[PDB]
Amino acid sequence: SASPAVAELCQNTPETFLEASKLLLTYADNILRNPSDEKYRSIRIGNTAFSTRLLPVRGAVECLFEMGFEEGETHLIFPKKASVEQLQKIRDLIAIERS
């Protein structure tokens, strides 16, 4: 598993890396652990946490794209076609780097 997005995320300062990676794990785990709950498959682009703590961080949105999210006008969406396996892959790579 050699992710360009996770590698880029890891180039951030330790504190910024921790902030963004925490959110990334949360978004993945919410889907992985609640497969029946469609609300976790969308993240609003203007959501305060997302827009201020994730989106500005180098590599972070690309981690979501590698997970399988796609960008819509107002939200990122984890589509019906998206593999849970791939979502899990990136979750695992991030978790290893968080320690």
UniProtKB/Swiss-Prot annotation:
Ubiquitously expressed with highest level in testis. Residues 19-80 form the PUB domain. It comes from the Eukaryota. It is found in: Cytoplasm. Changing residue 30 to P: Abolishes interaction with VCP. Specifically deglycosylates the denatured form of N-linked glycoproteins in the cytoplasm and assists their proteasome-mediated degradation. Cleaves the beta-aspartyl-glucosamine (GlcNAc) of the glycan and the amide side chain of Asn, converting Asn to Asp. Prefers proteins containing high-mannose over those bearing complex type oligosaccharides. Can recognize misfolded proteins in the endoplasmic reticulum that are exported to the cytosol to be destroyed and deglycosylate them, while it has no activity toward native proteins. Belongs to the transglutaminase-like superfamily. PNGase family. The PUB domain mediates the interaction with VCP. Component of a complex required to couple retrotranslocation, ubiquitination and deglycosylation composed of NGLY1, SAKS1, AMFR, VCP and RAD23B. Interacts with the proteasome components RAD23B and PSMC1. Interacts with directly with VCP. Interacts with DERL1, bringing it close to the endoplasmic reticulum membrane. Interacts with SAKS1. This is Peptide-N(4)-(N-acetyl-beta-glucosaminyl)asparagine amidase.
